[PDB]
Design a protein around this motif. Structure first.
Motif, short mmCIF file in Angstrom:
data_model
loop_
_atom_site.label_atom_id
_atom_site.label_comp_id
_atom_site.label_asym_id
_atom_site.label_seq_id
_atom_site.Cartn_x
_atom_site.Cartn_y
_atom_site.Cartn_z
N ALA A 48 -6.59 -3.44 5.22
CA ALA A 48 -5.41 -3.00 5.94
C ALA A 48 -4.27 -3.98 5.64
O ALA A 48 -4.49 -5.18 5.47
CB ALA A 48 -5.69 -2.95 7.43
N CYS A 50 -1.12 -4.24 7.68
CA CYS A 50 -0.44 -3.72 8.87
C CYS A 50 -0.32 -4.81 9.97
O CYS A 50 -0.80 -5.92 9.81
CB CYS A 50 -1.25 -2.54 9.38
SG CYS A 50 -2.91 -3.03 9.97
N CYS A 52 -1.32 -3.85 13.28
CA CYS A 52 -2.16 -3.20 14.30
C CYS A 52 -2.74 -4.24 15.25
O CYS A 52 -3.17 -5.29 14.80
CB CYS A 52 -3.31 -2.46 13.62
SG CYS A 52 -2.91 -0.79 13.05
N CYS A 110 -9.13 -1.03 11.64
CA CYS A 110 -8.15 -0.16 12.29
C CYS A 110 -8.07 1.13 11.42
O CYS A 110 -8.83 1.28 10.45
CB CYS A 110 -6.80 -0.88 12.34
SG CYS A 110 -6.13 -1.26 10.70
N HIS A 112 -6.02 1.75 9.18
CA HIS A 112 -5.55 1.39 7.83
C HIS A 112 -6.63 0.75 6.95
O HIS A 112 -6.42 0.62 5.74
CB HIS A 112 -4.31 0.48 7.89
CG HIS A 112 -3.18 1.04 8.68
ND1 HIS A 112 -2.81 0.48 9.88
CD2 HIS A 112 -2.36 2.09 8.42
CE1 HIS A 112 -1.81 1.22 10.34
NE2 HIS A 112 -1.51 2.21 9.50
ZN LIG Z 1 -3.74 -1.20 10.90
#
Ligand SMILES: [Zn+2]
Ligand SMILES: CSc1cn(C)nc1NC(=O)N1CCC[C@H](C(N)=O)C1
Length: 139
Positions: A48, A50, A52, A110, A112
């Motif tokens: 991921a 990101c 998050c 997550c 992603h």
């Molecule tokens: Zn994420």
């Protein structure tokens, strides 16, 4: 136990790395409890990229996945152990969840992809070593 397999790399908790991991070393950071080694086969884990703060982690001591809200990666003090003296571990994210020492290596994900791995715990809390900032895991 547990690892992240992406491309020609294997990511494990540095305190659980093998002789083969150290004899095929790419990068290691004791302050993050991470160690990355090379592999002959191709891994297909998506990392991921990101910010998050919600996800799901695998808890080996319960043979179950748990949904968690987790904090932003930061410097958190970690008690002494047979692997490290008392110190601040960087790039660590905490959540309210069950964990025991053998849980280290369990993946946190997550929507992603892979966010990081279980690395610390104690007192009804669980800590995850973040890997989202390690952009070179793809190049
Ligand atoms: Zn994420
Ligand atoms: C291994 S997670 C854990 C859950 N409980 C109840 N206790 C736990 N022990 C730990 O936090 N650590 C021991 C193994 C190394 C860790 C580190 N990254 O410095 C610290």
């Amino acid at each position: 136990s547990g690892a992240i397999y992406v491309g020609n790399y294997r990511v494990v908790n540095r305190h659980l790395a093998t002789h083969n991991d150290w004899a095929n070393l790419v990068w290691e950071d004791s302050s993050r409890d991470l160690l990355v080694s090379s592999t002959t086969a191709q891994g297909c884990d998506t990392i991921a990229r990101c910010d998050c703060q919600t996800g799901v982690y695998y808890c080996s001591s319960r043979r179950k996945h748990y949904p968690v809200s987790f904090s932003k990666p930061s410097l958190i003090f970690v008690e002494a152990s047979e692997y490290y003296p008392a110190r601040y571990q960087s790039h660590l994210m905490l959540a309210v969840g069950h964990s025991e020492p053998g849980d280290c290596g369990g993946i946190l994900r997550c929507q992603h992809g892979v966010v990081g791995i279980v690395s610390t715990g104690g007192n009804g809390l669980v800590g995850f070593a973040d890997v989202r900032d390690l952009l070179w895991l793809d190049e």
